Amino acid sequence: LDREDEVRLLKYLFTLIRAGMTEEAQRLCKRCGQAWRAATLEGWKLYHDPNVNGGTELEPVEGNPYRRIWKISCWRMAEDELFN
Amino acid sequence: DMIHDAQMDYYGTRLATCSSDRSVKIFDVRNGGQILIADLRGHEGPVWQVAWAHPMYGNILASCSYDRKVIIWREENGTWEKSHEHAGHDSSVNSVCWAPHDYGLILACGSSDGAISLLTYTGEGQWEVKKINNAHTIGCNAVSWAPAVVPPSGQKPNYIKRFASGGCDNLIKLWKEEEDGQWKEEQKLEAHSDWVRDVAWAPSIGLPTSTIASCSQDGRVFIWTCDDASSNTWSPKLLHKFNDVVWHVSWSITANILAVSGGDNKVTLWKESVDGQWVCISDVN
Amino acid sequence: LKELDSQLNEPREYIQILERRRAFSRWLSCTATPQIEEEVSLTQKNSPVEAVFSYLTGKRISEACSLAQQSGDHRLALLLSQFVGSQSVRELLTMQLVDWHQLQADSFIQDERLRIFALLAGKPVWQLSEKKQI
Amino acid sequence: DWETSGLVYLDYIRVIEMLRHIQQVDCSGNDLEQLHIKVTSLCSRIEQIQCYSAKDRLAQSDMAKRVANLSTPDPQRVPLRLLAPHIGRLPMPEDYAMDELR
């Protein structure tokens, strides 16, 4: 039952990402209890510092420097088979 | 003297044999003629199971032993030198198999002290060993992945992520994955009465009804199959019940004929009929 | 210390203070290399992540980056390159440490990467107490 | 973007042919530096990259040493004492030309 619930949550997240509601998918994952999944999905944006980059000066620094590492991990997960 | 497990290579090429004398012989089969090439030796215990890798990543062949270590030697230019060596287990290794051909170079090996292993090679050879403890009550004895389950752009296609293991405490099924660090297994199925010997999953030939055979020490052979994809149904079907224990259990790729090996030192071929009941085809040897 | 070419502002000594600090760092590295050359061979047989931490103590950014890249890492090589000692990353390292200290059983980070992550925050023997180098 | 192994393999054979056909010409001709850089980049994978490939390492070493007895070849050395004194057997050459004190 937990496996089926996780599969349904993953399918709903994929449908939301295909429709174009990343914030809604992250909120749904946080409400369900997939904090790690939400943190991994939110890491698609690159690093943007407000003090260094004077063009898009915002409030705080958002992003991550391991974008290539996350992409390689996602590629390895997509290459692996026989599970979810 | 007595061999343990001897699996073939790719497209009926070599035949990597393993015995109880700590000798991993790689014999070649050319038109039915057996010929030895090299004898990989370097373990303190007896060799158990052995599984060869895919042909896309060169020519690798991993073999487990009873020295609490896993050796993975390559084969190029006539040099069968040992590449990577994983010794993260506490007790002896029982079963050791690899993943699919499209999963890169992922190999799963089970120990006997209630733990397992999962060596995932990167872009060079850094196998990230991410294992722990607290598995079955007595340890692992079966390790075999399921079929290459597939998931619209133009790059590397997705699949189903990595999640597979197997215990010996009367429990042997599949597993589930997620989208976090690694994977969260979720597939509880218990129908055995004693220690589970071997449990190999049947390869799907395009159909979504994935099956998985298992063999315990009580003599029963369970065939757990699923009703549909992403469904909470793991009903097992009893194929045959023998007086002695069973050793290994392999399955075919065409008709998915179950090869029940065990009992009175004889192998039997089981095939599903049109009525749904499994019947014995013929007797080997 | 005396500078060769004079600058425009002669009220604030910034070139001599940097040259003296660089000379002191080069002297400390040369004095510590005789005790770091023998400890690097024994640390490689235990964990491959300790080589970068051992080479970073002798004031060598390229040697640490190469050691982090040869170990199969990707984020460590990019994090060790910004070891100048400025802001931005100083608060980011503390935030990452505070986030990793909770979660579930303080996560499961290693001992070699924790020191390298805490050294880029401007304080290793003080803040914070959860990853102090005392 | 990624075309170094093939270039090194094509430059090694040409360098060997030029050395076998002309032993007096020992000058770097543009492509020599590129071939040396490619050989170094190929040998780095076996030196420090956690890559356990004996056949590829031997092939790269052969491609690098095919032009060792022609130009200057400042490197030309197999595994050092960091990984040969504790194991031995394999990787032990390219340093037997030191009978006297320079």
Swiss-Prot record, chain A:
Disulfide bonds: none annotated. It comes from the Eukaryota. Ubiquitously expressed in fetal and adult tissues. It is found in: Nucleus membrane; Nucleus, Nuclear pore complex; Chromosome, Centromere, Kinetochore. Transmembrane segments: none annotated. Belongs to the nucleoporin Nup84/Nup107 family. Part of the nuclear pore complex (NPC). Forms part of the Nup160 subcomplex in the nuclear pore which is composed of NUP160, NUP133, NUP107 and Nup96; this complex plays a role in RNA export and in tethering Nup98 and NUP153 to the nucleus. Does not interact with TPR. Interacts with ZNF106. It is linked to Nephrotic syndrome 11: A form of nephrotic syndrome, a renal disease clinically characterized by severe proteinuria, resulting in complications such as hypoalbuminemia, hyperlipidemia and edema. Kidney biopsies show non-specific histologic changes such as focal segmental glomerulosclerosis and diffuse mesangial proliferation. Some affected individuals have an inherited steroid-resistant form and progress to end-stage renal failure. NPHS11 is an autosomal recessive, steroid-resistant and progressive form with onset in the first decade of life. Ovarian dysgenesis 6: A form of ovarian dysgenesis, a disorder characterized by lack of spontaneous pubertal development, primary amenorrhea, uterine hypoplasia, and hypergonadotropic hypogonadism as a result of streak gonads. ODG6 is an autosomal recessive condition. Plays a role in the nuclear pore complex (NPC) assembly and/or maintenance. Required for the assembly of peripheral proteins into the NPC. May anchor NUP62 to the NPC. Involved in nephrogenesis. This is Nuclear pore complex protein Nup107. It comes from Homo sapiens (Human). The gene is NUP107. The chain holds residues 338 to 421 of 925 of the full protein.
Swiss-Prot record, chain B:
Keywords: Acetylation, Cytoplasmic vesicle, Endoplasmic reticulum, ER-Golgi transport, Lysosome, Membrane, mRNA transport, Nuclear pore complex, Nucleus, Phosphoprotein, Protein transport, Repeat, Translocation, Transport, WD repeat. GO terms for cellular component: COPII vesicle coat; cytosol; endoplasmic reticulum membrane; ER to Golgi transport vesicle membrane; extracellular exosome; GATOR2 complex; intracellular membrane-bounded organelle; lysosomal membrane. Disulfide bonds: none annotated. WD repeats lie at residues 1-37, 42-83, 88-131, 135-185, 191-234, 241-280. Functions as a component of the nuclear pore complex (NPC) and the COPII coat. At the endoplasmic reticulum, SEC13 is involved in the biogenesis of COPII-coated vesicles. Required for the exit of adipsin (CFD/ADN), an adipocyte-secreted protein from the endoplasmic reticulum. As a component of the GATOR2 complex, functions as an activator of the amino acid-sensing branch of the mTORC1 signaling pathway. The GATOR2 complex indirectly activates mTORC1 through the inhibition of the GATOR1 subcomplex. GATOR2 probably acts as an E3 ubiquitin-protein ligase toward GATOR1. In the presence of abundant amino acids, the GATOR2 complex mediates ubiquitination of the NPRL2 core component of the GATOR1 complex, leading to GATOR1 inactivation. In the absence of amino acids, GATOR2 is inhibited, activating the GATOR1 complex. Belongs to the WD repeat SEC13 family. This is Protein SEC13 homolog. It comes from Homo sapiens (Human).
UniProtKB/Swiss-Prot annotation, chain D:
It comes from the Eukaryota. The modification Phosphothreonine is found at residue 72. This is Nuclear pore complex protein Nup96. The chain holds residues 1685 to 1802 of 1817 of the full protein.
